[PDB]
Amino acid sequence: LKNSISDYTEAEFVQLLKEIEKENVAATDDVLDVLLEHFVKITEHPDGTDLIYYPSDNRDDSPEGIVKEIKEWRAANGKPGFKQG
Amino acid sequence: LKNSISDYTEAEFVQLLKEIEKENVAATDDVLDVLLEHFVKITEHPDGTDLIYYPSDNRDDSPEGIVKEIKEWRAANGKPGFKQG
């Protein structure tokens, strides 16, 4: 868990997404909830966790599909995006 | 990492598969290699890691697709399968 979106590279962010995918089949919810809270906090995208559970039909339902959407929304709104690397 | 296939439930096994998916985009290979060694050791399936990188066309390319294939191969060969749970 890093403090902001600008601390993540795109690949470090899809690793966070994979951690969320793993905790989706965890026995309990405890870690999943903090991961999902964190995702909502740092991305600040209006759709929140719908990015994961309810992807746009126009958009690729994959971790790199989610990365693309966040990158584009943040760019349109003049906010800092991902770290390059 | 558990000692054998019989120690894993199907869901605990797809969590192992998700850990492998995450380490596929890791910076380095170090953890991925032990995860892949372990996968080959406990499943004892003839295809080894091809189950992950080179799935059968007849078969669903998903973590639960891989679980199905292992379960069926082990059953046909009279070996203990997954823990129920």
Swiss-Prot record, chains A, B:
Source organism superkingdom: Bacteria
InterPro entries: Colicin_E_sf, Colicin_pyocin
Family matches, as Pfam families: Colicin_Pyocin
Gene3D superfamilies: Colicin E immunity protein
CDD domains registered for this protein in UniProt: Col_Im_like (cd16363)
GO molecular function: toxic substance binding
Keywords: Bacteriocin immunity, Plasmid
Keyword Transmembrane (UniProt): no
SUPFAM superfamilies on file: Colicin E immunity proteins
GO BP term (any one): bacteriocin immunity
Family: Belongs to the colicins ColE2/ColE8/ColE9 and pyocins S1/S2 family.
Function comment: This protein is able to protect a cell, which harbors the plasmid ColE7 encoding colicin E7, against colicin E7, it binds specifically to the DNase-type colicin and inhibits its bactericidal activity. Dimeric ImmE7 may possess a RNase activity that cleaves its own mRNA at a specific site and thus autoregulates translational expression of the downstream ceiE7 gene as well as degradation of the upstream ceaE7 mRNA.
Stated name of the protein: Colicin-E7 immunity protein
